[PDB]
Coordinates of N, CA and C in Angstrom, one line a residue:
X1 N -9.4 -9.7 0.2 CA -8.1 -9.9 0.8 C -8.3 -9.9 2.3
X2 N -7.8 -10.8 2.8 CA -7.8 -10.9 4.3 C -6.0 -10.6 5.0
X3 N -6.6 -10.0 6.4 CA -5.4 -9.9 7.3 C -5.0 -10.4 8.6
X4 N -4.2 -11.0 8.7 CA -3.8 -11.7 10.1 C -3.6 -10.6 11.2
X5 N -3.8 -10.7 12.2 CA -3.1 -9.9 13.4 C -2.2 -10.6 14.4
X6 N -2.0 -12.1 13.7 CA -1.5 -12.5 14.8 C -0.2 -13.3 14.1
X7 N -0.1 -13.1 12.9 CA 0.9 -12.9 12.4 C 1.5 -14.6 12.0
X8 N 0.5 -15.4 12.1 CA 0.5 -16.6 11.7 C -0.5 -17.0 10.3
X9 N -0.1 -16.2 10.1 CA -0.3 -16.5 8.3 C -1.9 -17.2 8.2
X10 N -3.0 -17.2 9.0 CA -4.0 -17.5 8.7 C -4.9 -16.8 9.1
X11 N -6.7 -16.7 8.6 CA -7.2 -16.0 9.2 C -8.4 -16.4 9.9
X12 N -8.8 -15.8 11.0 CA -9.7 -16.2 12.0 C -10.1 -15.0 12.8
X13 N -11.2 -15.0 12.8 CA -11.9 -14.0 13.6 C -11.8 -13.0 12.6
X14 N -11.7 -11.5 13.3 CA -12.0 -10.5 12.5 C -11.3 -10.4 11.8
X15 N -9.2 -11.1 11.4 CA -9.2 -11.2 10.1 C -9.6 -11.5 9.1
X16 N -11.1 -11.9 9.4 CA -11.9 -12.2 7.9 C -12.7 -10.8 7.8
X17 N -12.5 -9.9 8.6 CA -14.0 -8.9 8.4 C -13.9 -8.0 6.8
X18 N -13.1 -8.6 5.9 CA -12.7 -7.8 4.6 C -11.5 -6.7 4.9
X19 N -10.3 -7.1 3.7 CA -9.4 -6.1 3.5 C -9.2 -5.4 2.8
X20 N -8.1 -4.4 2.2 CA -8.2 -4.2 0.6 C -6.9 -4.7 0.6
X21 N -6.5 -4.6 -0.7 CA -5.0 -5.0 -1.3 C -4.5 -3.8 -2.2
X22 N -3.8 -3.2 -1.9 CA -3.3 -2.2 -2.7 C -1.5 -2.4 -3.8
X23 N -1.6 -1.6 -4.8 CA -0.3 -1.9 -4.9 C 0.4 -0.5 -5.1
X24 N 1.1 -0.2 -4.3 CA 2.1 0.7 -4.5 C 3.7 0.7 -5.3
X25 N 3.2 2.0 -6.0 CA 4.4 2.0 -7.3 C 4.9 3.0 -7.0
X26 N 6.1 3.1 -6.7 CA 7.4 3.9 -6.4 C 8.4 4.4 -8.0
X27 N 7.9 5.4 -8.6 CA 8.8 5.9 -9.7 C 10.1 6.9 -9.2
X28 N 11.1 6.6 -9.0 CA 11.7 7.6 -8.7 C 13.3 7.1 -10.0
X29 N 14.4 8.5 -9.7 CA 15.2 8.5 -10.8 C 16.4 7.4 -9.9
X30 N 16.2 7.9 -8.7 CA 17.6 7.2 -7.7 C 16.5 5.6 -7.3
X31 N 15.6 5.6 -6.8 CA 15.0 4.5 -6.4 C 13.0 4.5 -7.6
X32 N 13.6 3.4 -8.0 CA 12.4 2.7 -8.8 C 11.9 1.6 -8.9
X33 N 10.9 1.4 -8.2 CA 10.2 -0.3 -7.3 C 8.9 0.1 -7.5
X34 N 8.3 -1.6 -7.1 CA 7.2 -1.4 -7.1 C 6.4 -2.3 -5.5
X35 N 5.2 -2.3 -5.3 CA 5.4 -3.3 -4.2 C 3.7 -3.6 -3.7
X36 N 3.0 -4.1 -2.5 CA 1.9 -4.4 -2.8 C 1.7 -4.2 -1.4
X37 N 0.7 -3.6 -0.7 CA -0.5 -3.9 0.6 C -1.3 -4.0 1.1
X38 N -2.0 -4.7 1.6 CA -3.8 -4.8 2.3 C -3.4 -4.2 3.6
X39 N -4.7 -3.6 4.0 CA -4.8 -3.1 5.0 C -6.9 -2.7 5.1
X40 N -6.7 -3.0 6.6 CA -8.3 -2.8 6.2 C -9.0 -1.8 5.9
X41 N -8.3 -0.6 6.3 CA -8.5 0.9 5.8 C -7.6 1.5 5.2
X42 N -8.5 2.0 3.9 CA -7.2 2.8 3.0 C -6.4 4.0 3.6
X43 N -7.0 3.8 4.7 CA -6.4 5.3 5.5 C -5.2 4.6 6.2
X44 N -5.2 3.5 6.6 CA -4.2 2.8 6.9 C -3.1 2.2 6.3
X45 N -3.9 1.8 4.5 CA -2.8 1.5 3.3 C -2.1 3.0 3.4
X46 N -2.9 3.9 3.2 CA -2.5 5.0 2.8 C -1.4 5.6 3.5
X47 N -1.2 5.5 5.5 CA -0.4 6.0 6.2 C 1.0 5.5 6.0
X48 N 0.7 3.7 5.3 CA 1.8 3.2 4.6 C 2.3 3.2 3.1
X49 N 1.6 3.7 2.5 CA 2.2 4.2 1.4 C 2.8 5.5 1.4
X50 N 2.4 6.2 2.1 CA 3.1 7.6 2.0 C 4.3 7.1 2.9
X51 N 4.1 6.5 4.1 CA 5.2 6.1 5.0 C 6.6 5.2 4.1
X52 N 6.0 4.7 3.0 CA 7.2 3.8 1.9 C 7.4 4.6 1.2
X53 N 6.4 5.9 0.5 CA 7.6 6.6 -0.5 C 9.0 7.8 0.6
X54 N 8.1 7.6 1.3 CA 9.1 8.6 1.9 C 10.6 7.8 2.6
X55 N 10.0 7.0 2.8 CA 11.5 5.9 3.4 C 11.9 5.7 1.6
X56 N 11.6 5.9 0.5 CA 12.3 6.2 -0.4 C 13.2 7.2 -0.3
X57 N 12.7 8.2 -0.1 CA 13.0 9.7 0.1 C 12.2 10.3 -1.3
X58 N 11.4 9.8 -2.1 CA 11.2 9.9 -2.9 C 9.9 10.9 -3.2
X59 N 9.8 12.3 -3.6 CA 8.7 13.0 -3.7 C 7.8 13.4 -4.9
X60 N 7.1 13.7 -5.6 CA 6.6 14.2 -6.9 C 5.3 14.2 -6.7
X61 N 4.8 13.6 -7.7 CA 3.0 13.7 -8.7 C 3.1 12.2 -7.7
X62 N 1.9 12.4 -6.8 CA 1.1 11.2 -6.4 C -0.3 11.3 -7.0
X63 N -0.5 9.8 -7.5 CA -1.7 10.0 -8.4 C -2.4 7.6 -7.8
X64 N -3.5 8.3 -7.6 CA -4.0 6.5 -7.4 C -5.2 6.6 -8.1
X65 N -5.1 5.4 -8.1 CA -6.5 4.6 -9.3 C -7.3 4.1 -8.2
X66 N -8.4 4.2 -8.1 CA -9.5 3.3 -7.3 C -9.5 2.2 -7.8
X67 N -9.8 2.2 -9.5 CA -9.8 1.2 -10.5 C -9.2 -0.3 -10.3
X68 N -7.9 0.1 -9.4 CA -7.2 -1.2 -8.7 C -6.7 -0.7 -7.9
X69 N -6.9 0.4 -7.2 CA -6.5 0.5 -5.8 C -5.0 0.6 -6.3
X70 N -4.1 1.3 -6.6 CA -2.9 1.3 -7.1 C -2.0 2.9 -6.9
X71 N -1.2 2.5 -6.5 CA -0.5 4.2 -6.2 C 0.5 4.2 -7.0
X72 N 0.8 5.4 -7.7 CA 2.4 6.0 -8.4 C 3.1 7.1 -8.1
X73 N 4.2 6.9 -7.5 CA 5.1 8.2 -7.2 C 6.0 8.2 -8.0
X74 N 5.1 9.6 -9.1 CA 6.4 10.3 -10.1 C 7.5 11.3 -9.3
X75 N 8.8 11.0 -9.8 CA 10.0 12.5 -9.4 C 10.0 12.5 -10.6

């Protein structure tokens, strides 16, 4: 998965240097979605996944799969 930084939808230069693609799954009782992100560091997916369950408001059992790179936030 590749990422643009210039926000024209294609990639060139170090948006090819490899991304990941993650998908984040939001379980909650009041808010339940699901949704997807690449970023080139999971430290980065990651500052945005926690950054989206919380703009859920949503807290519990966070649990991720390497297996597909996949996050779930149980309440």
């Amino acid at each position: 998965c590749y990422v643009d930084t210039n926000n024209d939808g294609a990639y060139e230069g170090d948006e090819l240097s490899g991304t990941m693609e993650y998908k984040l799954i939001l379980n909650g009782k009041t808010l339940k979605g699901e949704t997807t992100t690449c970023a080139v560091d999971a430290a980065t997916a990651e500052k945005v996944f926690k950054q989206y369950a919380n703009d859920n408001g949503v807290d519990g059992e966070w649990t991720y799969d390497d297996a597909t790179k996949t996050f779930t936030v149980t309440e």
